[PDB]
Amino acid sequence: MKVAVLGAAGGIGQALALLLKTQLPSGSELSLYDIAPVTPGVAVDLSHIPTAVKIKGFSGEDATPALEGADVVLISAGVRRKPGMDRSDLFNVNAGIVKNLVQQVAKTCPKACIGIITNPVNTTVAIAAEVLKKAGVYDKNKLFGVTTLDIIRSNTFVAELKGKQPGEVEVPVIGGHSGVTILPLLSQVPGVSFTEQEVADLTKRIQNAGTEVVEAKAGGGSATLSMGQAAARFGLSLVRALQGEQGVVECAYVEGDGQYARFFSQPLLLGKNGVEERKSIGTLSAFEQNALEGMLDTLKKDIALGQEFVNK
Amino acid sequence: MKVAVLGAAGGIGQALALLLKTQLPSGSELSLYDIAPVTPGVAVDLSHIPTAVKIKGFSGEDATPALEGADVVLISAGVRRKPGMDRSDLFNVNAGIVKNLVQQVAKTCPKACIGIITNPVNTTVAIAAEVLKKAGVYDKNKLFGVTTLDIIRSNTFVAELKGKQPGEVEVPVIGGHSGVTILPLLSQVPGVSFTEQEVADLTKRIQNAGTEVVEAKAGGGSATLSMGQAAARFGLSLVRALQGEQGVVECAYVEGDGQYARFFSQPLLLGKNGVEERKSIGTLSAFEQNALEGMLDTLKKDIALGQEFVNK
């Protein structure tokens, strides 16, 4: 398998690259790309770690060399927000970056599985889909908005609340990735029960977790190391499925049946061709039903902002 | 076990912290310290990863809170070199940093195992030893200069030369950590044989590997991600030994029998109290014997520079 990381010199890209270098299967290839001129030296740095994964780094305006033969492309380029901003406030600076990079993907490796990490994901995935459609190359089973950080945050917060082992709790999270559209399905967590006060408090903590890190870094950026971890988990799940492993399921933001919104994060069975099946969100508590109904107008405005950008 | 990382906000400290958060045994504690005000937010970032390792981050001039109850202290604070400099050119900026931090260690957790990563290690370990002696608290079995990056670099370069699996070759490296004092014992690598031209060429590549990364980053720093990996390996070896695991051996720069120089890196059996035994360097080829004899005057000048700093 070959995995390309676009945005490899940033805080997220370097943590991701380190985890992938040490965790990809033997025989894998990793290519790193950023316009930052340090990028080939980030690759030489990593190439000294004794694992059977070839790594090369590329710089400049042209990502083609990084993209040739890529099976998975992970896009983490983009600016972080500062204290007092929302994710959607990043649209002006990051929209053009995603458009440019996905055009290069569309020409060089149109059959690759593409994971978008760039903020605000609810909108940037819609930009990517429209770029791919305009190129005549869009496959809705191969475009993912990476929401895995919401999952592993939920796993941590639940285990600590409930005295469980963090490695042993998995919570489904649906919706999107913004303060209003992150919906953890606490009613579906096996072996644990919550009071209604616990549900309200946890859902708050989970929805505002990104802001809590931005506040705690005090102008020094947003979550990088935990986001590197979360993206490495998603990328490894992708690589396992593409290699033929059975029963790999992850929640991601994907174009689906449109029953809630055009793009929506839900549980997915992954296979050799991207998403194999979009699984049912199951039965919702009254709290969860209410939260889902309340987010829908905000989500489809997020989506419409991305489509507008590409199409007007 | 509690592990403190001093210098947690730099490139090395953040990679190290990520690997330790994900790899320390369940029940461990990790405390991060840097004067950089982003440091508590680096800890909040990592605290969202679902493993059973408590993490806290501290900022400011006082490292005491990070040091209370620490069993292992890993010191990675310090400036990197730029293209055209040598490691020893970092003495002016980094000597005072190491002195200050090791004074705080000497007051708060004098019984902790201390690993020094700060460049130039041949000299900064001598500074630390003299600070601890002046405090009345020095234990030569608990002070380590971390040389593990030379080991894993050698493992990578040999496996690729010889068509082996990188995970399956271990090469002993003795001496110190500088372009003249890194001596890989290629004659002692099990199952592989080298021509005399291969020995000369590999030993060169290994000795200049740090400069190759500094050149490749072009002013963007030195090795951070591979150094984070190497230090995480050493720290985990330390933690295993302290918990009672048998037969844990690592090469590190340590005060020993003085037969070559006061401090010298050689294979060490680790146990519950730091170093258990300093193992023999074994039999050297003619090349290796010659290289060892040629480095000795440079090494003891490195050591003398550190002692001078503390004692005059």
Coordinates of C-alpha atoms in Angstrom, one line a residue:
Chain A
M1 CA 0.0 0.0 0.0
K2 CA 1.2 3.6 -0.6
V3 CA -0.2 6.3 1.8
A4 CA 0.4 10.0 0.9
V5 CA 0.2 12.7 3.7
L6 CA -0.5 16.2 2.3
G7 CA 0.3 18.8 4.9
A8 CA 3.1 16.7 6.4
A9 CA 5.1 19.6 8.0
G10 CA 2.4 20.9 10.4
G11 CA 1.8 19.8 13.9
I12 CA -0.8 17.2 12.9
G13 CA 1.2 16.0 9.8
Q14 CA 4.3 15.3 11.8
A15 CA 2.6 13.3 14.6
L16 CA 0.6 11.4 12.0
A17 CA 3.7 10.7 10.0
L18 CA 5.6 9.4 13.0
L19 CA 2.7 7.0 14.0
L20 CA 2.3 5.7 10.4
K21 CA 6.1 5.2 10.0
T22 CA 6.0 3.0 13.1
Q23 CA 2.7 1.3 12.6
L24 CA 2.0 0.7 8.9
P25 CA 2.4 -2.9 7.7
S26 CA 5.9 -4.0 6.4
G27 CA 6.2 -3.4 2.7
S28 CA 4.2 -0.1 2.9
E29 CA 5.3 3.2 1.3
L30 CA 4.7 6.6 2.9
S31 CA 5.1 9.8 1.0
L32 CA 5.1 13.2 2.6
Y33 CA 4.2 16.5 0.9
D34 CA 4.0 20.1 2.1
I35 CA 5.0 23.4 0.4
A36 CA 7.2 24.1 3.5
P37 CA 10.8 23.5 2.5
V38 CA 11.6 21.6 5.7
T39 CA 9.5 18.7 4.3
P40 CA 12.2 16.5 2.7
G41 CA 14.1 16.8 6.0
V42 CA 11.1 15.6 8.0
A43 CA 11.2 12.5 5.8
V44 CA 15.0 11.9 6.3
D45 CA 14.4 12.3 10.1
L46 CA 11.8 9.5 10.0
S47 CA 13.8 7.3 7.5
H48 CA 16.2 6.6 10.4
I49 CA 13.5 4.6 12.3
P50 CA 14.0 0.8 11.8
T51 CA 10.7 -0.4 10.3
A52 CA 10.0 -1.8 6.9
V53 CA 8.2 1.3 5.5
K54 CA 9.9 3.3 2.8
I55 CA 9.4 7.1 3.2
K56 CA 10.1 10.0 0.9
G57 CA 9.3 13.7 1.4
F58 CA 8.5 16.4 -1.2
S59 CA 8.3 20.2 -1.2
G60 CA 7.2 22.9 -3.6
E61 CA 4.0 23.7 -5.5
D62 CA 3.6 20.4 -7.2
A63 CA 2.3 17.4 -5.2
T64 CA 2.3 15.0 -8.1
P65 CA 5.4 13.1 -7.1
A66 CA 3.9 12.4 -3.7
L67 CA 0.7 11.3 -5.3
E68 CA 1.8 8.9 -8.0
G69 CA 0.5 5.4 -7.1
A70 CA -1.1 6.4 -3.8
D71 CA -3.9 4.2 -2.5
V72 CA -4.8 6.4 0.5
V73 CA -4.4 10.2 0.7
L74 CA -4.7 11.9 4.1
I75 CA -5.1 15.7 3.9
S76 CA -4.1 17.7 7.0
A77 CA -3.0 21.0 5.5
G78 CA -4.6 24.2 6.9
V79 CA -4.5 26.9 9.5
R80 CA -5.5 26.4 13.1
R81 CA -8.0 28.6 15.0
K82 CA -7.1 31.0 17.9
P83 CA -9.0 31.5 21.2
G84 CA -12.4 33.2 20.6
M85 CA -12.8 31.8 17.0
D86 CA -15.1 29.0 15.8
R87 CA -14.1 26.3 13.2
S88 CA -16.3 27.9 10.5
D89 CA -14.2 31.1 10.8
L90 CA -11.4 29.1 9.1
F91 CA -13.4 28.8 5.8
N92 CA -11.7 31.8 4.2
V93 CA -8.1 30.6 4.7
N94 CA -8.6 26.8 4.2
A95 CA -11.2 26.5 1.4
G96 CA -8.7 27.3 -1.3
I97 CA -6.0 25.0 0.1
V98 CA -8.4 22.0 -0.1
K99 CA -9.6 22.9 -3.5
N100 CA -6.0 23.1 -4.9
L101 CA -4.8 19.8 -3.3
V102 CA -7.9 17.8 -4.3
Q103 CA -7.4 19.0 -8.0
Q104 CA -4.0 17.4 -7.9
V105 CA -5.5 14.2 -6.4
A106 CA -8.2 14.1 -9.2
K107 CA -5.5 14.2 -11.9
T108 CA -2.8 11.9 -10.4
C109 CA -4.6 9.3 -8.2
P110 CA -8.4 9.5 -8.8
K111 CA -8.9 5.9 -7.5
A112 CA -7.4 6.6 -4.0
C113 CA -9.3 6.7 -0.8
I114 CA -9.2 10.3 0.4
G115 CA -9.4 11.4 4.1
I116 CA -10.0 15.1 4.8
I117 CA -8.9 16.4 8.2
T118 CA -8.7 20.1 7.2
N119 CA -11.0 22.4 9.3
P120 CA -14.0 23.0 9.0
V121 CA -14.6 19.3 7.9
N122 CA -18.4 19.7 7.4
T123 CA -17.7 22.2 4.7
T124 CA -14.3 21.0 3.2
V125 CA -15.6 17.5 2.4
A126 CA -18.3 19.2 0.3
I127 CA -15.6 21.2 -1.6
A128 CA -13.6 18.0 -2.3
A129 CA -16.7 16.2 -3.6
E130 CA -17.5 19.0 -6.0
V131 CA -13.9 19.2 -7.3
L132 CA -13.9 15.5 -7.9
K133 CA -17.3 15.7 -9.7
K134 CA -16.1 18.5 -11.9
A135 CA -13.1 16.4 -12.8
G136 CA -15.4 13.5 -13.8
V137 CA -13.9 11.2 -11.2
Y138 CA -16.0 11.3 -8.0
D139 CA -16.6 8.1 -6.2
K140 CA -18.8 8.6 -3.1
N141 CA -17.4 5.4 -1.4
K142 CA -13.9 6.8 -1.4
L143 CA -14.3 10.3 0.2
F144 CA -14.2 10.6 4.0
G145 CA -14.3 13.4 6.5
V146 CA -12.2 12.2 9.4
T147 CA -14.2 12.4 12.6
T148 CA -12.2 9.8 14.6
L149 CA -11.0 12.4 17.2
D150 CA -14.6 12.7 18.5
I151 CA -14.7 8.9 19.0
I152 CA -11.5 8.6 21.0
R153 CA -12.4 11.7 23.1
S154 CA -15.7 10.1 24.0
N155 CA -14.0 6.8 24.9
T156 CA -11.6 8.7 27.3
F157 CA -14.4 10.8 29.0
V158 CA -16.8 7.8 29.5
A159 CA -14.1 5.4 30.9
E160 CA -13.0 8.0 33.4
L161 CA -16.5 8.9 34.4
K162 CA -17.5 5.3 34.7
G163 CA -14.3 3.7 36.1
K164 CA -13.8 1.5 33.0
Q165 CA -10.5 0.7 31.1
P166 CA -10.2 3.4 28.3
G167 CA -9.1 0.8 25.8
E168 CA -12.2 -1.2 26.4
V169 CA -15.0 1.4 25.7
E170 CA -16.1 2.4 22.2
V171 CA -18.8 5.0 21.7
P172 CA -20.6 5.7 18.4
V173 CA -20.6 9.3 17.3
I174 CA -22.8 10.6 14.5
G175 CA -23.5 13.9 12.8
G176 CA -20.5 16.0 11.9
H177 CA -17.5 17.8 13.4
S178 CA -18.6 21.1 14.9
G179 CA -19.9 22.2 18.3
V180 CA -23.5 21.7 17.4
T181 CA -23.2 18.7 15.1
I182 CA -21.2 16.3 17.2
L183 CA -23.6 13.8 18.7
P184 CA -22.2 11.0 20.8
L185 CA -24.6 8.0 21.1
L186 CA -24.2 7.4 24.8
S187 CA -27.4 5.2 24.8
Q188 CA -25.6 2.7 22.7
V189 CA -22.5 2.2 24.8
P190 CA -22.3 -1.5 25.8
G191 CA -22.2 -2.3 29.5
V192 CA -22.6 1.3 30.8
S193 CA -25.6 3.3 32.0
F194 CA -25.9 7.1 32.4
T195 CA -28.3 9.4 34.3
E196 CA -29.9 12.2 32.3
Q197 CA -27.6 14.6 34.1
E198 CA -24.6 12.5 33.1
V199 CA -25.8 12.5 29.5
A200 CA -26.2 16.3 29.3
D201 CA -22.8 16.9 31.0
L202 CA -20.8 14.4 28.9
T203 CA -22.4 15.5 25.6
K204 CA -21.4 19.1 26.5
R205 CA -17.8 18.1 27.4
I206 CA -17.5 16.1 24.2
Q207 CA -18.9 18.9 21.9
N208 CA -16.6 21.6 23.4
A209 CA -13.5 19.5 23.7
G210 CA -11.8 21.2 20.7
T211 CA -12.3 24.6 22.2
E212 CA -11.0 23.4 25.5
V213 CA -7.6 22.6 23.9
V214 CA -7.5 25.9 21.9
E215 CA -8.1 27.7 25.2
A216 CA -5.5 25.6 27.0
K217 CA -2.8 26.3 24.4
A218 CA -3.5 30.0 24.7
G219 CA -2.7 31.0 21.1
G220 CA -0.2 28.2 20.5
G221 CA -2.6 26.2 18.3
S222 CA -5.3 23.5 18.5
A223 CA -5.1 19.8 19.1
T224 CA -2.2 18.2 17.2
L225 CA -1.0 15.1 19.0
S226 CA -4.4 13.5 19.8
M227 CA -5.5 14.5 16.3
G228 CA -2.4 12.7 14.9
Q229 CA -3.4 9.6 16.9
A230 CA -7.0 9.7 15.7
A231 CA -6.1 10.1 12.1
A232 CA -3.5 7.3 12.4
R233 CA -6.2 5.0 13.7
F234 CA -8.5 5.9 10.8
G235 CA -5.7 5.5 8.2
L236 CA -4.7 2.1 9.6
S237 CA -8.4 1.0 9.5
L238 CA -8.5 2.1 5.9
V239 CA -5.3 0.2 5.0
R240 CA -6.6 -3.0 6.8
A241 CA -9.8 -2.9 4.8
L242 CA -8.1 -2.2 1.5
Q243 CA -5.9 -5.3 2.2
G244 CA -9.0 -7.5 2.6
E245 CA -9.5 -7.6 6.4
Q246 CA -13.1 -8.4 7.4
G247 CA -15.4 -6.5 9.7
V248 CA -13.5 -3.2 9.9
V249 CA -16.0 -0.5 10.9
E250 CA -15.4 3.2 11.6
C251 CA -17.6 6.2 11.9
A252 CA -16.8 8.9 9.2
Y253 CA -18.5 11.8 7.5
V254 CA -19.5 10.5 4.1
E255 CA -22.0 11.1 1.3
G256 CA -24.9 8.8 1.9
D257 CA -28.6 8.3 1.5
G258 CA -29.4 12.0 2.2
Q259 CA -32.0 11.0 4.8
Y260 CA -30.6 13.6 7.2
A261 CA -28.2 15.7 5.1
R262 CA -26.2 15.0 1.9
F263 CA -23.1 14.3 4.0
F264 CA -23.5 12.7 7.4
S265 CA -21.2 10.8 9.8
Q266 CA -22.5 7.3 10.7
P267 CA -21.0 3.8 11.2
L268 CA -19.5 2.3 8.0
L269 CA -18.3 -1.2 7.1
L270 CA -15.1 -0.7 5.1
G271 CA -13.9 -3.1 2.4
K272 CA -11.6 -3.3 -0.6
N273 CA -13.3 -0.4 -2.5
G274 CA -13.8 2.2 0.2
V275 CA -17.1 2.0 2.0
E276 CA -18.8 -1.4 1.8
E277 CA -22.0 -0.5 3.7
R278 CA -23.4 2.5 5.5
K279 CA -24.8 1.0 8.7
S280 CA -27.9 2.1 10.5
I281 CA -27.6 4.6 13.4
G282 CA -29.9 2.3 15.5
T283 CA -32.3 3.4 18.1
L284 CA -32.0 6.8 19.7
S285 CA -32.9 8.0 23.2
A286 CA -35.3 11.0 23.5
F287 CA -32.2 13.2 24.2
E288 CA -30.4 11.9 21.1
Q289 CA -33.5 12.2 18.9
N290 CA -33.9 15.9 20.0
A291 CA -30.2 16.7 19.5
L292 CA -30.3 15.1 16.0
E293 CA -33.4 17.2 15.0
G294 CA -31.9 20.4 16.3
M295 CA -28.6 20.1 14.4
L296 CA -30.0 19.5 10.9
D297 CA -30.4 23.0 9.7
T298 CA -26.8 24.0 10.7
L299 CA -25.3 20.9 9.0
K300 CA -26.9 21.6 5.6
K301 CA -25.8 25.2 5.8
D302 CA -22.2 24.0 6.4
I303 CA -22.6 21.7 3.4
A304 CA -24.1 24.4 1.2
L305 CA -21.2 26.8 1.9
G306 CA -18.7 24.2 0.4
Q307 CA -20.8 23.5 -2.7
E308 CA -21.2 27.3 -3.3
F309 CA -17.5 27.8 -3.1
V310 CA -16.8 25.4 -6.0
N311 CA -19.8 26.0 -8.1
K312 CA -20.3 29.8 -8.2
Chain B
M1 CA 5.8 4.6 37.9
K2 CA 5.9 8.4 37.3
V3 CA 8.0 9.8 34.4
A4 CA 8.8 13.5 34.1
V5 CA 9.7 15.1 30.7
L6 CA 11.6 18.4 31.1
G7 CA 11.5 20.2 27.8
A8 CA 8.1 18.9 26.8
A9 CA 7.1 21.7 24.4
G10 CA 10.0 21.3 21.9
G11 CA 10.0 19.1 18.8
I12 CA 11.7 16.2 20.7
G13 CA 9.6 16.7 23.8
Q14 CA 6.2 16.5 22.0
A15 CA 7.1 13.3 20.0
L16 CA 8.5 11.7 23.1
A17 CA 5.3 12.6 25.1
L18 CA 3.0 11.2 22.4
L19 CA 4.9 7.9 22.4
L20 CA 5.1 7.6 26.2
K21 CA 1.3 8.5 26.5
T22 CA 0.5 5.6 24.2
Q23 CA 3.1 3.1 25.3
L24 CA 3.7 3.4 29.0
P25 CA 2.2 0.6 31.2
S26 CA -1.4 1.1 32.5
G27 CA -1.3 2.9 35.9
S28 CA 1.7 5.1 34.9
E29 CA 1.9 8.9 35.4
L30 CA 3.4 11.3 33.0
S31 CA 4.2 14.9 33.9
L32 CA 5.3 17.5 31.3
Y33 CA 7.3 20.6 32.1
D34 CA 8.6 23.5 29.9
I35 CA 8.9 27.3 30.5
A36 CA 6.9 27.7 27.3
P37 CA 3.3 28.7 28.3
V38 CA 1.8 26.3 25.7
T39 CA 2.9 23.3 27.9
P40 CA -0.3 22.8 30.0
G41 CA -2.2 22.7 26.6
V42 CA 0.1 20.1 25.2
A43 CA -0.9 17.9 28.2
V44 CA -4.7 18.6 27.7
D45 CA -4.2 17.6 24.0
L46 CA -2.6 14.3 25.0
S47 CA -5.1 13.7 27.9
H48 CA -7.8 13.0 25.2
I49 CA -6.0 9.8 24.1
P50 CA -7.7 6.7 25.7
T51 CA -4.9 5.0 27.6
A52 CA -4.5 4.4 31.3
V53 CA -1.7 6.9 31.8
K54 CA -2.5 10.1 33.8
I55 CA -0.9 13.2 32.3
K56 CA -0.4 16.8 33.6
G57 CA 1.5 19.7 32.1
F58 CA 3.3 22.6 33.9
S59 CA 4.8 25.9 32.8
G60 CA 6.8 28.7 34.5
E61 CA 10.3 28.8 36.1
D62 CA 9.6 26.2 38.8
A63 CA 9.7 22.5 37.7
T64 CA 9.1 21.2 41.3
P65 CA 5.4 20.3 40.7
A66 CA 6.4 18.2 37.6
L67 CA 9.2 16.5 39.7
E68 CA 7.4 15.5 42.9
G69 CA 7.5 11.7 43.1
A70 CA 9.2 11.1 39.7
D71 CA 11.0 7.8 39.2
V72 CA 12.4 8.6 35.8
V73 CA 13.3 12.2 34.5
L74 CA 14.0 12.7 30.8
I75 CA 15.7 16.0 29.9
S76 CA 15.2 17.2 26.4
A77 CA 15.3 21.0 26.8
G78 CA 17.8 22.9 24.6
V79 CA 18.5 24.7 21.3
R80 CA 19.2 22.8 18.0
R81 CA 22.1 23.5 15.7
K82 CA 21.9 25.0 12.3
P83 CA 23.7 23.9 9.1
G84 CA 27.5 24.5 9.4
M85 CA 27.6 24.1 13.2
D86 CA 28.9 21.2 15.3
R87 CA 27.2 19.8 18.4
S88 CA 29.9 21.3 20.7
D89 CA 29.0 24.8 19.4
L90 CA 25.8 24.4 21.4
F91 CA 27.7 24.4 24.8
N92 CA 27.2 28.2 25.4
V93 CA 23.4 28.1 25.1
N94 CA 22.6 24.7 26.6
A95 CA 25.1 24.3 29.5
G96 CA 23.1 26.7 31.8
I97 CA 19.8 25.1 31.0
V98 CA 21.0 21.6 32.1
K99 CA 22.6 23.0 35.2
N100 CA 19.4 24.8 36.2
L101 CA 17.1 21.8 35.6
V102 CA 19.4 19.2 37.3
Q103 CA 19.5 21.5 40.5
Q104 CA 15.8 21.2 40.7
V105 CA 16.0 17.4 40.2
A106 CA 18.7 17.2 43.0
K107 CA 16.3 19.0 45.5
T108 CA 13.0 17.3 44.6
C109 CA 13.6 13.8 43.3
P110 CA 17.3 12.9 44.0
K111 CA 16.6 9.1 43.8
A112 CA 15.2 9.3 40.2
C113 CA 16.9 7.8 37.2
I114 CA 17.9 10.7 34.9
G115 CA 18.3 10.6 31.2
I116 CA 20.0 13.5 29.5
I117 CA 19.2 14.1 25.8
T118 CA 20.4 17.8 25.7
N119 CA 23.2 18.4 23.1
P120 CA 26.2 18.0 23.4
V121 CA 25.6 15.0 25.6
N122 CA 29.3 14.1 26.0
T123 CA 29.6 17.4 28.0
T124 CA 26.1 17.9 29.5
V125 CA 26.2 14.5 31.3
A126 CA 29.4 15.7 33.1
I127 CA 27.7 19.0 34.1
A128 CA 24.8 17.0 35.6
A129 CA 27.1 14.6 37.5
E130 CA 29.0 17.6 39.1
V131 CA 25.7 19.4 40.0
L132 CA 24.5 16.2 41.8
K133 CA 27.8 15.7 43.6
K134 CA 27.8 19.3 44.8
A135 CA 24.3 18.6 46.1
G136 CA 25.5 15.5 48.0
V137 CA 23.2 13.3 46.1
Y138 CA 25.0 11.8 43.1
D139 CA 24.4 8.1 42.3
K140 CA 26.5 7.0 39.3
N141 CA 24.1 4.1 38.6
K142 CA 21.2 6.6 37.9
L143 CA 22.7 9.1 35.5
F144 CA 22.5 8.3 31.7
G145 CA 23.4 10.1 28.5
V146 CA 20.9 8.9 26.0
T147 CA 22.7 7.5 23.0
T148 CA 19.8 5.3 21.6
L149 CA 19.5 7.2 18.4
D150 CA 22.9 5.9 17.3
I151 CA 21.7 2.3 17.8
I152 CA 18.4 2.6 15.8
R153 CA 20.2 4.5 13.0
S154 CA 22.8 1.7 12.8
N155 CA 20.0 -1.0 12.8
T156 CA 18.3 0.8 9.8
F157 CA 21.5 1.3 7.8
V158 CA 22.7 -2.3 8.3
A159 CA 19.4 -3.9 7.4
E160 CA 19.1 -1.9 4.2
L161 CA 22.6 -2.6 3.2
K162 CA 22.4 -6.3 4.0
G163 CA 18.7 -7.1 3.0
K164 CA 17.7 -7.9 6.5
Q165 CA 14.4 -7.0 8.4
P166 CA 15.1 -3.7 10.3
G167 CA 13.3 -5.0 13.3
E168 CA 15.6 -8.0 13.5
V169 CA 19.1 -6.4 13.6
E170 CA 20.7 -4.9 16.8
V171 CA 24.1 -3.2 16.6
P172 CA 26.1 -2.3 19.7
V173 CA 27.4 1.2 19.6
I174 CA 30.1 2.4 22.1
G175 CA 31.9 5.7 22.9
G176 CA 29.9 8.9 23.0
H177 CA 27.6 11.0 20.8
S178 CA 29.6 13.2 18.5
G179 CA 31.0 12.8 15.0
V180 CA 34.3 11.4 16.2
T181 CA 33.2 9.4 19.3
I182 CA 30.3 7.4 17.8
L183 CA 31.7 3.8 17.2
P184 CA 29.3 1.2 15.9
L185 CA 30.6 -2.3 16.6
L186 CA 29.8 -3.9 13.2
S187 CA 32.1 -6.8 13.9
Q188 CA 29.7 -7.9 16.6
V189 CA 26.5 -7.9 14.6
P190 CA 25.0 -11.5 14.7
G191 CA 24.5 -13.2 11.3
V192 CA 26.0 -10.5 9.1
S193 CA 29.4 -9.9 7.5
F194 CA 31.0 -6.8 6.1
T195 CA 33.9 -6.1 3.7
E196 CA 36.4 -3.6 4.9
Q197 CA 35.0 -1.1 2.5
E198 CA 31.5 -1.7 3.8
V199 CA 32.8 -1.1 7.4
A200 CA 34.4 2.2 6.5
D201 CA 31.4 3.5 4.5
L202 CA 28.8 2.5 7.1
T203 CA 30.8 3.9 10.0
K204 CA 31.0 7.2 8.1
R205 CA 27.2 7.2 7.4
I206 CA 26.4 6.5 11.0
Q207 CA 28.8 9.1 12.4
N208 CA 27.5 11.9 10.1
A209 CA 23.8 10.9 10.3
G210 CA 22.9 13.9 12.6
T211 CA 24.5 16.3 10.2
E212 CA 22.7 14.8 7.3
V213 CA 19.3 15.6 8.9
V214 CA 20.4 19.2 9.9
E215 CA 21.4 19.7 6.3
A216 CA 18.2 18.2 4.9
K217 CA 16.0 20.4 7.2
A218 CA 17.8 23.5 5.9
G219 CA 17.6 25.7 8.9
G220 CA 14.4 24.1 10.2
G221 CA 16.1 22.2 13.0
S222 CA 17.7 18.8 13.7
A223 CA 16.3 15.3 14.2
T224 CA 13.1 15.4 16.3
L225 CA 10.8 12.5 15.4
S226 CA 13.5 9.7 15.3
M227 CA 15.0 11.2 18.4
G228 CA 11.6 11.1 20.1
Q229 CA 11.4 7.4 19.1
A230 CA 14.9 6.6 20.4
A231 CA 14.3 8.3 23.7
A232 CA 10.9 6.5 24.1
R233 CA 12.7 3.2 23.6
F234 CA 15.3 4.1 26.3
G235 CA 12.6 5.4 28.7
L236 CA 10.5 2.3 28.3
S237 CA 13.6 0.1 28.9
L238 CA 14.3 2.0 32.1
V239 CA 10.6 1.6 33.2
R240 CA 10.7 -2.2 32.6
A241 CA 13.9 -2.6 34.5
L242 CA 12.6 -0.5 37.4
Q243 CA 9.5 -2.7 37.6
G244 CA 11.6 -5.8 37.9
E245 CA 11.9 -7.2 34.4
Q246 CA 15.0 -9.4 33.8
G247 CA 17.7 -9.1 31.2
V248 CA 17.0 -5.5 30.0
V249 CA 20.2 -4.3 28.3
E250 CA 20.8 -0.9 26.6
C251 CA 23.9 1.0 25.6
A252 CA 24.1 4.4 27.3
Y253 CA 26.8 7.0 28.2
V254 CA 27.5 6.4 31.9
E255 CA 30.2 7.0 34.5
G256 CA 32.1 3.7 34.8
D257 CA 35.5 2.2 35.5
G258 CA 37.4 5.0 33.8
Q259 CA 39.4 2.6 31.7
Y260 CA 38.8 4.6 28.6
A261 CA 37.4 7.9 29.9
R262 CA 35.4 8.9 33.0
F263 CA 32.1 8.7 31.1
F264 CA 31.8 6.1 28.3
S265 CA 28.9 4.5 26.5
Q266 CA 28.9 0.7 26.7
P267 CA 26.3 -2.1 27.1
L268 CA 24.5 -2.1 30.5
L269 CA 22.3 -4.5 32.3
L270 CA 19.6 -2.5 33.9
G271 CA 17.7 -3.4 37.2
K272 CA 15.6 -2.0 40.0
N273 CA 18.3 0.5 41.0
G274 CA 19.6 1.9 37.7
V275 CA 22.5 0.2 36.2
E276 CA 23.0 -3.4 37.5
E277 CA 26.2 -4.2 35.6
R278 CA 28.4 -2.4 33.0
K279 CA 29.1 -5.1 30.5
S280 CA 32.3 -5.8 28.6
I281 CA 32.7 -4.2 25.1
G282 CA 33.9 -7.6 23.9
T283 CA 36.5 -8.2 21.1
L284 CA 37.2 -5.4 18.6
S285 CA 38.3 -5.7 15.1
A286 CA 41.5 -3.9 14.0
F287 CA 39.4 -1.1 12.5
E288 CA 37.4 -0.8 15.8
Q289 CA 40.5 -0.9 18.0
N290 CA 42.0 1.9 15.9
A291 CA 38.9 4.1 15.9
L292 CA 38.6 3.6 19.7
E293 CA 42.2 4.7 20.3
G294 CA 41.8 7.7 18.0
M295 CA 38.7 9.1 19.8
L296 CA 40.0 9.1 23.4
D297 CA 41.6 12.5 23.6
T298 CA 38.5 14.2 22.1
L299 CA 36.2 12.4 24.5
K300 CA 38.1 13.5 27.7
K301 CA 38.2 17.1 26.4
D302 CA 34.4 17.0 26.0
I303 CA 34.1 15.7 29.6
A304 CA 36.6 18.2 31.0
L305 CA 34.6 21.1 29.5
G306 CA 31.5 20.1 31.5
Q307 CA 33.3 19.6 34.8
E308 CA 35.1 23.0 34.3
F309 CA 31.7 24.7 33.8
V310 CA 30.3 23.6 37.2
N311 CA 33.6 23.7 39.2
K312 CA 35.3 27.0 38.3

